[PDB]
Structures are given as structure tokens and as C-alpha cells.
């Protein structure tokens, strides 16, 4: 239980470090309001205090998200609402030339937060999030696999991503040309990565319900194997 207190402490402390780091970068801040840093370094703070006082006023959406992870706040509306803000903020800074540049930065921002939250489903609803991201990025130049690659990098497994994505595919009454493409990129990404999946029945595959794996599952069995993760 001592361990219990220690670990929680480490987590909260880490958050302050992150908030502290951002404060430096932020240009909205004044050096004389050093007081905030003094407060940050000075002690552990209440989560609500950290959230209400710091995250909201300084619009650190990522921090807010991570904090709520630790809190374990489930409420989907609030969690999603926070996500909307982060995405919206991202749009503001962008100019267009950096479609690729923003593409990277966007993936960078998401992956970082994603790594921290991804273990839990509440902040990182993979199902809800994927489309949301695609939709956001859609108003940008596109290369297939851009959306999914971030989640893979986020720490999400190929197997987890596959089932949810397939559900997204089949579940939607609609065109989802985008999903088809991305899944196509995902399968291609996956087969090359493990040696297990590797080979010929694949090249033909240009995403459809012509699931190579689906066929495989029918005959041999559903047992893919252990989870495969990106190295």
C-alpha cells in the first residue's frame, strides 16, 4: 500500500513536470509569473487543482487528458469534449504547405498522448477516436495509412486495431473509401512486420471484405497468435 501511494505520487509528479515544461514553451506566460513554477516544483498538487487551475487556463489539453487518465474519469462526453478541443486547437496553428509538416506534428502530438493513455480504453476509445482523427485530417492532403500508423505507433496492437477497424468497415452503412484504404495499408504494414503472416495472398488484396485473414480464420481457426506490436 506504501507502493500504492508511491506510484500514484510518481504519476502526479510527472504531470507537473510536463506542465512545467510546457509553461516554458508557452509564450502566453510572463516570466515574472514565476510563481507558477515555484508552485509546480514546490509540491504535489490536487488533481482537480492541477486540472482546473493549470490545464484549463493554459489550455493544455494533452495534460488535462493525461490527468483524467490517472483520475480514471470515465465520462465519455467530458472525455470526448476535451478531445474535440485538442483537435480544434491543432487546426488553428496550421497553415497549409505543412500538410505533411502538420501531418507529422499532428501524429507526433497524438502518439505521445496516445502512448500514455492508450492502455485504457476510456480516454483512448480506439473505436471512437479513429474516425474522429480521419475526419479531422480529411481536410488535408492524404496518404493512406497516415491515420492508422499513428495508432500503431501509439502502442496499439495490430490485432486490436484490426478487429475494431473491421467493425468500423462493416458496421457503417456507407462509402468508407478511406477506411478501406487505411486498412489496406494496415494489413500491408502488418504482414511485413511479422514473419508469421508473410507472403503472396496479399498483393491482390486491395481492402474489401476480401479479408485475407478472414479466409485464413475460417479454415485454420481464429487463433492469430499473441498480440503483435510495432517495434
Amino acid at each position: 500500500e506504501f507502493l500504492h501511494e508511491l506510484e500514484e505520487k510518481m504519476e502526479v509528479a510527472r504531470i507537473q513536470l510536463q506542465i512545467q515544461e510546457t509553461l516554458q514553451r508557452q509564450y502566453s506566460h510572463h516570466s515574472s509569473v514565476q510563481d507558477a513554477v515555484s508552485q509546480l516544483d514546490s509540491e504535489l498538487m490536487d488533481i482537480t487543482k492541477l486540472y482546473g487551475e493549470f490545464a484549463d487556463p493554459f489550455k493544455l489539453a494533452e495534460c488535462k487528458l493525461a490527468i483524467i487518465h490517472c483520475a480514471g474519469y470515465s465520462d465519455p462526453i467530458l472525455v470526448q469534449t476535451l478531445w474535440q478541443d485538442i483537435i480544434e486547437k491543432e487546426l488553428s496553428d496550421s497553415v497549409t504547405l505543412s500538410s505533411s509538416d502538420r501531418m507529422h506534428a499532428l501524429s507526433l502530438k497524438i502518439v505521445l498522448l496516445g502512448k500514455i493513455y492508450a492502455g485504457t480504453p476510456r480516454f483512448f476509445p480506439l473505436d471512437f477516436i479513429v474516425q474522429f482523427l480521419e475526419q479531422q485530417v480529411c481536410t488535408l492532403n492524404w496518404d493512406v495509412g497516415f491515420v492508422i500508423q499513428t495508432m500503431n505507433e501509439i502502442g496499439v496492437p495490430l490485432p486490436r486495431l484490426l478487429e475494431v477497424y473491421d467493425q468500423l468497415f462493416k458496421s457503417r452503412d456507407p462509402k468508407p473509401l478511406h477506411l478501406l484504404d487505411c486498412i489496406h495499408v494496415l494489413l500491408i504494414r502488418y504482414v511485413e512486420n511479422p514473419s508469421q503472416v508473410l507472403n503472396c495472398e496479399r498483393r491482390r488484396f486491395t481492402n474489401l471484405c476480401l479479408d485475407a485473414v478472414c479466409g485464413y480464420l475460417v479454415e485454420l481457426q481464429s487463433m492469430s497468435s499473441s498480440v503483435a506490436v510495432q517495434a
Binding site: L187, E192, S195, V197, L198, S222
Partner: protein, 290 residues
């Protein structure tokens, strides 16, 4: 280079073996990622590419490239360890749960399958598990094609899985050790039990669709039988005798198959070829029928 992908591949194997994840849903994701990784590594290349690489190595006359072979070897080592553990998990899982997650796991099993064909797996896998289960599932395959109409819907699930199962069986048959394991599992028996062959498909939805479907099942099973036959020593060997019995017992189907048309014809044509290969491959079915 999909080196970065490699790490995810390792994580995936780790999770699967652990079999943590109350959700098969989680494991389905793992299976999907692994499937893509295995597929991705070998962009569609066939024996010609491998032969060219070997020659180049030939020997390092100068600076060779042996990059893809090296990558495959690393994948296969990782996979081996984790493998025994994970094979157990993957097959059991198979069955149940997830008729769903199934589409994903059978596909993962088949890709993996090529690579790591040869080796490794045959031994491990053999044993267990699989064979027993898969042969029994042949019998039940026949029953499953009928239940096929109903479940057209639940079809989506199973096409992803049943076809994958046939493929897995065909692949095991392609090699000597695999064919032996299938045959040991009593393939001919299950096929007799399925009664897929010992009947006439025409006897009996728009009818041409059902003929295409039934004939379709016949072509894959017939390929599995032909492959098992040839893959041993088809001659004096025991395998030849077993295949001949297969032909004679299911004769007249072979004969009946020989003439007619449609996409149905296309399936029929393939079935006809498959019987012909079975015929010559054995003691010439004709030769035997002196």
C-alpha cells in the same frame, strides 16, 4: 524499412502468449497486426526471387544482397520462441470465441504459415493440436456447407474462417512432414464421414449459385487430397494406395465431372484437373484399373 514495425510485432507476440485480455477482441487486434506484418515483410515474391538471391550470394562474388532472407530469419526466430506458447493459445482460442475473432486468427495462422513452413512449426503444431481438431472439423465442413445456407449470414464470419481453414490444410499438405500429419489425423476418414464426395452435387436460391458453391468446396478438398498424396512418395508408398481407394470409391463423380459449363464450369474445370492430377499421381487410376 519496417524495422520499427518489428518491435510492434514482438509486443503482439508477447501479449498473445500471455493471453491476457479478457477480450478476444483484444486478441483479434493482435492477430490482425501480426497478419499484416507477416504479409508486409514478403512483398509478393515467389521462388524465382529466392533463387536469384542465392545465386548473388554466389558466392559473394562481390557485395551481395541477402536482405530479405535475413529479415525472414529474424522474424522466424522471434516467432519460434514465443511460439510454442502462443500456438497453444491461438488454437484453443480458435475455437471458440471467437467465431469472430476467427476471421482474424485463421488468417494469421495461414500467413504465418508460409514462413515459418517449414519448419518450425511442423513440428510443434503438429502435434497438438491442430490436427486432431482440423480433421474433425472436415467432417463437420460438410455439414457446415449446408448449415451455409443459414447461416449466409453468419457467413460473413465463417467465410473469413472456413476458407482460411481449407487453406491452412492445403498448406500443411504441400510439404512432406505436414502431409504426413494430416494423413495421420485420418484425413480420408473424415472426408468419408463428411460424405462430401460420396454423392452427386447436381441432385440437390438460384441453382447455379448453389452448384458453384458446392463444387467450390469440392475443388479445395480435392486439392488437399491430391496434395497429401503427391507430397508423400506417391508410388509404392501407402499414400498411393489410399488415394486410389479415394478415386475408386468416389468414382463416377470423377467421370461425371469431366463434361459441361459456366463459372460453375470454371469450378468444374478446376475440379476435373484436380481429379486428373490425383489420377496420374497415384498409380494411374486407369493403370490400376487394368
Amino acid at each position: 524499412g519496417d524495422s520499427s514495425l518489428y518491435i510492434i510485432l514482438k509486443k503482439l507476440l508477447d501479449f498473445i502468449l500471455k493471453t491476457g485480455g479478457g477480450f478476444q477482441r483484444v486478441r483479434t487486434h493482435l492477430y490482425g497486426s501480426l497478419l499484416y506484418y507477416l504479409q508486409i515483410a514478403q512483398r509478393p515474391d515467389e521462388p524465382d526471387t529466392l533463387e536469384a538471391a542465392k545465386k548473388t550470394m554466389w558466392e559473394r562474388l562481390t557485395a551481395p544482397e541477402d536482405v530479405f532472407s535475413k529479415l525472414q530469419r529474424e522474424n522466424i526466430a522471434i516467432i519460434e520462441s514465443y511460439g510454442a506458447a502462443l500456438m497453444e493459445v491461438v488454437c484453443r482460442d480458435a475455437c471458440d470465441g471467437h467465431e469472430i475473432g476467427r476471421m482474424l486468427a485463421l488468417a494469421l495462422l495461414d500467413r504465418i504459415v508460409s514462413v515459418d513452413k517449414q519448419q518450425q512449426w511442423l513440428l510443434y503444431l503438429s502435434n497438438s493440436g491442430y490436427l486432431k481438431v482440423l480433421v474433425d472439423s472436415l467432417v463437420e465442413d460438410d455439414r457446415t456447407l449446408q448449415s451455409l445456407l443459414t447461416p449466409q449470414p453468419p457467413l460473413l464470419k465463417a467465410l473469413y474462417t472456413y476458407e482460411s481453414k481449407m487453406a491452412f490444410l492445403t498448406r500443411v499438405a504441400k510439404i512432406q512432414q505436414g502431409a504426413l500429419e494430416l494423413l495421420r489425423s485420418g484425413v480420408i476418414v473424415r472426408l468419408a464421414q463428411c460424405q462430401v464426395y460420396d454423392m452427386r452435387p447436381e441432385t440437390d436460391m438460384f441453382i447455379p449459385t448453389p452448384v458453384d458453391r458446392y463444387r467450390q468446396i469440392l475443388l479445395p478438398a480435392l486439392q488437399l487430397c491430391q496434395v497429401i498424396l503427391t507430397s508423400s512418395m506417391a508410388q509404392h508408398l501407402q499414400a498411393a494406395g489410399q488415394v486410389l481407394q479415394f478415386l475408386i470409391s468416389h468414382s463416377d463423380t470423377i467421370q461425371a465431372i469431366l463434361r459441361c459449363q459456366d463459372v460453375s464450369a470454371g469450378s468444374l474445370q478446376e475440379l476435373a484437373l484436380l481429379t486428373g492430377i490425383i489420377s496420374k499421381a497415384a498409380l494411374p487410376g486407369i493403370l490400376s484399373e487394368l
